[PDB]
Design a protein around this ligand. Structure first.
Ligand SMILES: [Ca+2]
Ligand SMILES: [Ca+2]
Ligand SMILES: [Ca+2]
Ligand SMILES: [Ca+2]
Lengths: 552, 552
């Protein structure tokens, strides 16, 4: 007869005053908090809400989570009563292949691609926006909202010899059509899995030119789209666009032209995910209830939580929602008060090693805090009634309210319009290369930092004469593609890839092999107004500079 | 009113402190462990978990198993509460038949094939892998994961007389298409059976060139895909690809060319298996519940167990999962602690004859232990807090945690990239042939070891002059096909198959009939850069060498 309105299985008090679970003999006991014996064994203080079957709203009873009696695929950090357990999928495009719409074998270009979830914010402050921008809900996207939108970029490097302008390469003239094709893979980034129907992602080019809308058959697949796990298992064959169909991908000269002008496409994905997999106390089985589909129980999550975009695990924007609270909602008050600090602890995993809220090493002060038009005030008003100018201090005293949005990104590197790892400062850059493993007339072998290397477009190999000459090897913007990468974790550079497949030429072993680095933000992808295919107008960074006798 | 949360029918204690079942009069009694009377009659100590309907997760109540009240097809070793009872099917291709896409009768090649489940691991340490390799879940296949992928090889031997280059044999020119066809059979290797819908296996060629996707109609068959039992009962007619259809298998000259260059295809199979067959206490019947399909209750197994790939029953990688435990999961702690030792006992059948954990004869020390990036540490940390360098010792003290992967393979033979019985050392090789049964001018009859013979491509028949000549009979790489095999278990060699159908020619009964053996790893399948169809560049092994008068 123990009091429990929620009916989830966690006696009100316990769920309000704090609780957790351990295993005596070999049984699981749900017991109240005990700062003593408990905080020692390493457990946690699971304080949830008594009036909600799942404080997060997601299809998983607070109990179901902590107890562990739930779909084993649910992300760990989501096994907690206050961490959203919803799926988030975006589309990755590994490589595309442009060809002249039907002896043709070399009349086709095939470049690789780099995809990465995005989170486009607002502009600077001049973009002419329609009057319907300062209305209620109208156009007020608050900078960023709910919707998955990935972004790919086409390898701007070379594929053949002296190729120039995809045009002449393929042979496309005004009255011609080019067919696009590519290999893409769905990949879940959230905290929950999808068991059947995948999303209906649409491929766009530019600001509205849709090139197609990919939505592979429903129920057709029984595979599982688990968290942090690419759909077509990385150990399988990546799905291929219109190539396995009766109407391919049409692209006219003008379009095919733009593609080259930016070498980038966009991928927007809906949210219609297959039904959900739930528990079943009776015989402890994992079933897919045709009666519960995210499309029903998902908006709630977004309407009663705090969203935080952090990028620590890598530079890829990771999303997570915490069980925040709303004042206007009685029920939503039954929720446990939330603090920005506590949040970053369960949401992603920040910890307090020696009393400093850091992340696997980095200090919470190494990341910039960016809020939306709303969240801004809601927090400003707190920093006010708390007398302070530094949030990193009163951090553990910031109340997170539902609908709150926060963007925690590493303060090291610079960021673009989509919030992507663009390129840091020369300082950090150089540092990452300070290490050397093997210098050769063939190519340098370094142990460059991953987090850094990801913001580098390429390297410019040159040679400075003992006087002051700037002779450069791969002098064409498209000759930056050199940096390789052994599976041992060491970046292997090669000068030979752009010098008649032959090693360096040292007429005088007293020169200076100057190998620079070019961050993405700086790198160029197309010739100048004229035909300057040179590395003249670039902002590279000195990464190497050894003498002729200081190599071999 | 006996305590039993799981509700499976095994009183908590019993299931935690150990239990088993026997038959008094003619009834089945579920009783607690008794080292005395019990361990004598030959029973076992079935220690399962009280909070899971089926500790393994599979659709079979711990009780249902031990009690025996379950689908009688379930593999024996799976009748145990801690051994996964899931199905695992891969596709075997007995023989293919290449022909020129539609007087044509000899313009067709028909070679046999050798299929075998695989388990592709990682490379050496240089394969340029995309940056998305050192991310979370991204590309981190951890070497090997969940997915069935078989591999076939095409008989590189001869079919006709002086045939050469399938090309001229069939008559395929640049502007031609070749149609492929073959006879394949589904075969279950797991521990559970499939009662209806078979898997959707896709036939691939190379690294991504899919030649077709076979998925015979659903419900079309009512036959059962029982464990260790080929689908189309070995005593029936093997299923045939596109041959019983409106769109065959297209293959252009360039492709048909590659096929010849490797003489091997790949077979990947999904996991969508038909619904499951469950019990029914009421009238003790075996029914197929449309409400429970593996696709629902199967991921769990892989998310809450230990996977061990052993190859003792043969050289074919056998998979099995044991009811391991996970620390982060309360429920999954209710499980019985697992030890690598105990595992290899129930998982495959290792036993302790005189105190040495061996397998049907071989000692646990005759197999190499290979773990994944994860499992490696999880075990290293144990060998650390246990002070030891040899795992074979502290074997019975290694805690197996869920998601753990282990590869136990015979240490005798060498292994490839797919973990297949390639070829051992000359030593072991020679040994297997030390036995002779009948020497003749026609062919040798031996009782070569099965485990060995499986790593042999063929034999080179030659004759050494009393001086030092190396005259070889079947001197062409494609003339290795000689070793036959009587159903009596004795390998019958024949020199006649490559000598005008006539027996040996002994001009001087004092020579040395040197018959070598060529392991798969060494054997060649195509001519050299030139046209060296000889056995010149080979690494054979001396298996025979008798005198002219020491035969007949
Ligand atoms: Ca409750
Ligand atoms: Ca509750
Ligand atoms: Ca029980
Ligand atoms: Ca049980």
């Amino acid at each position: 007869t123990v009091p429990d309105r929620d009916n989830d299985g966690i006696p009100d008090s316990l769920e309000v005053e704090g609780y957790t679970v351990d295993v005596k003999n070999k049984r699981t006991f749900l017991s109240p908090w005990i700062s003593n014996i408990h905080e020692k064994k390493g457990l946690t203080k699971y304080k949830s809400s008594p009036e909600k079957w799942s404080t997060a709203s997601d299809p998983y009873s607070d109990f179901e989570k902590v107890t562990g009696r739930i779909d084993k695929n649910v992300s760990p950090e989501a096994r907690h009563p206050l961490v959203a357990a919803y799926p988030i999928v975006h589309v990755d495009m590994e490589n595309i292949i442009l060809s002249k719409n039907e002896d043709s074998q070399t009349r086709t270009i095939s470049k690789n691609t780099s995809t990465s979830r995005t989170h486009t914010s607002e502009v600077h402050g001049n973009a002419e926006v329609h009057a319907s921008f300062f209305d209620i809900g109208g156009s007020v996207s608050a900078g960023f909202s709910n919707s998955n939108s990935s972004t790919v970029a086409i390898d701007h490097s070379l594929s053949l010899a002296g190729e120039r302008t995809w045009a002449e390469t393929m042979g496309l003239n005004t009255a011609d059509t080019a067919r696009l094709n590519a290999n893409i893979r769905y990949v879940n980034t959230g905290t929950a899995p999808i068991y059947n129907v995948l999303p209906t992602t649409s491929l766009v080019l530019g600001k509205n030119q849709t090139l197609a809308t990919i939505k592979a058959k429903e129920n057709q697949l029984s595979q599982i789209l688990a968290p942090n796990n690419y759909y077509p298992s990385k150990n399988l064959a990546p799905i291929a666009l219109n190539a396995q169909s009766s109407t391919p991908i049409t692209m006219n000269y003008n379009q095919f032209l733009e593609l080259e002008k930016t070498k980038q496409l966009r991928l927007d994905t809906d949210q219609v995910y297959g039904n959900i997999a739930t528990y079943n106390f009776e015989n402890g089985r994992v079933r897919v209830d045709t009666g519960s589909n995210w499309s029903e129980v998902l908006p709630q999550i977004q309407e009663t939580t705090a969203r935080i975009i952090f990028n620590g695990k890598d530079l890829n924007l990771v999303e997570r929602r915490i069980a925040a609270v709303n004042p206007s909602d009685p029920l939503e008050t039954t929720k446990p008060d939330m603090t920005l600090k506590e949040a970053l602890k369960i949401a992603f995993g920040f910890n307090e090693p020696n009393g400093n809220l850091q992340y696997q090493g980095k200090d919470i002060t190494e990341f910039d805090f960016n809020f939306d038009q709303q969240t801004s005030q809601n927090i400003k008003n707190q920093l006010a009634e708390l007398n302070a100018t530094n949030i990193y201090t009163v951090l553990d005293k910031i109340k997170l309210n539902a609908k709150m949005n926060i963007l925690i990104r590493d303060k090291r590197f610079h960021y673009d319009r989509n919030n992507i790892a663009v390129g840091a400062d020369e300082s950090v850059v150089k540092e990452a290369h300070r290490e050397v493993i093997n210098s050769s007339t063939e190519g340098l072998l370094l142990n460059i930092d991953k987090d850094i290397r990801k913001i580098l477009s390429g390297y410019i190999v040159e040679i400075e004469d003992t006087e002051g000459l700037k002779e450069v090897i791969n002098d064409r913007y498209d000759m930056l593609n050199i940096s390789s990468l052994r599976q041992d974790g060491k970046t292997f550079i090669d000068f030979k890839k752009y010098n008649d497949k032959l090693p360096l030429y040292i007429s005088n072993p007293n020169y200076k092999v100057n190998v620079y680095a070019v961050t993405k933000e700086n790198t160029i992808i197309n010739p100048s107004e004229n035909g300057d295919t040179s590395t003249n107008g670039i902002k590279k960074i000195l990464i190497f500079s050894k003498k002729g006798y200081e190599i071999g």
